[PDB]
């Protein structure tokens, strides 16, 4: 269970 995370913003971020 790997996600890519994004760069400029964090993981959960993208919410």
Request: hydrophobic share 20%; glycine share 0%; net charge negative.
């Amino acid at each position: 269970d790997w996600e890519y995370h994004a760069h400029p913003k964090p993981n959960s971020x993208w919410t």
